[PDB]
Amino acid sequence: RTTRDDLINGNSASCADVIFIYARGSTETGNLGTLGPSIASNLESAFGKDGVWIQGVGGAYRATLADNFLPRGTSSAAIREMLGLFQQANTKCPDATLIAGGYSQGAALAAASIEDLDSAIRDKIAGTVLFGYTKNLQNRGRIPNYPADRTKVFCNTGDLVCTGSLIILAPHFAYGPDARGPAPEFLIEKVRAVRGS
């Protein structure tokens, strides 16, 4: 339901052509949360069940509230977790195109992990989508070390976390529409431009 593990248990002899690594937000259940499943259903329709592997960031990432106050908007531990998954994907399936996404704290996590990622693997990521990015102001609407034409941030009007504060108002919980449509569509568009399809 809110937990998908296709990379971790993924059989190398049956590699997906695409792999989606996603990070939930504070307090959210499973390793996908409330938005994760929405994007996934879309990826499976465009590519097929056998076409994509959906992987959430669980393990050591335990979307804690207090960790929003840490230097990089997340824990040192969580960053290694997500970083670890990228390396694993590149290992089991070196020909698979990679894509990623994150929400609130997971948005911060995605930014930090891809920033610390080995450049050769980082080039494999066709696209990344971020919702209610907590480090938007600070990181100037971008992901450190990642290209503009591959990044897509969603920051509703009124959401102060995008402005640079940690005040959580109502707009922060309104990314459902985005996740059901513009998010997966941008990712799918990205996968086909870099491969052929």
Q: What is the CATH number of the domain that holds 120?
A: 3.40.50.1820
Query: 130 - beta bridge partners?
Result: 102, 153
Answer yes or no: 165 catalytic.
no
- 27-44 b/e with 16+ CB inside 10 Å = b? ebebbbbbbbbbbbebbb
How far is 87 from 183, CA to CA, in rounded Å? 24
Answer yes or no: 6 catalytic.
no
How far is 75 from 69, CA to CA, in rounded Å? 9
Domain count, the chain: 1
How far is 18 from 106, CA to CA, in rounded Å? 21
Q: Is the dihedral of CA 166, 34, 150, 63 positive or negative?
A: positive
Candidates 38, 75, 104, 113; catalytic one? 104
In angstroms, how far is CA 113 from the centroid of its own chain? 10
> What Rg do the C-alpha atoms of the chain give, in angstroms?
15
User: From residue 124, how far is each of 27, 86, 90, 136 by CA, in Å?
Assistant: 30, 10, 9, 23
Quick one: tokens of 171? 């707009």
Method: X-ray
Which residues touch 91 (CB under 8 Å, ≥6 apart)? Answer: none
For residue 25, what are the domain limits? 1-197
DSSP calls for 129-163:
EEES-TTTTTTTTS-TT--GGGEEEE--TT-GGGT
Q: Find, among 196, 151, 8, the residue nearest to 89 by Cα.
A: 8
Candidates 159, 165, 178, 197; catalytic one? 159
Residue 2 per-residue DSSP state: -
**What burial class does residue 91 get, using C-beta atoms within 10 Å of its C-beta: 0-12 exposed, 13-18 middle, 19+ buried?**
exposed
**What burial class does residue 130 get, using C-beta atoms within 10 Å of its C-beta: 0-12 exposed, 13-18 middle, 19+ buried?**
buried
Candidates 38, 67, 75, 172; catalytic one? 172
Query: 22 - beta bridge partners?
Result: 56, 101
Quick one: tokens of 35? 């938005």
Contact by Cβ (8 Å): 164, 136: yes
Answer yes or no: 197 catalytic.
no
How far is 78 from 64, CA to CA, in rounded Å? 10
Which runs of consecutive H residues, i.e. helices, occur in the chain? 36-47, 76-92, 105-116, 119-122, 176-180, 182-195
- Resolution of this model in Å is 2.7
Contact by Cβ (8 Å): 141, 115: no
Which residues touch 77 (CB under 8 Å, ≥6 apart)? Answer: 60, 61
**What burial class does residue 118 get, using C-beta atoms within 10 Å of its C-beta: 0-12 exposed, 13-18 middle, 19+ buried?**
exposed
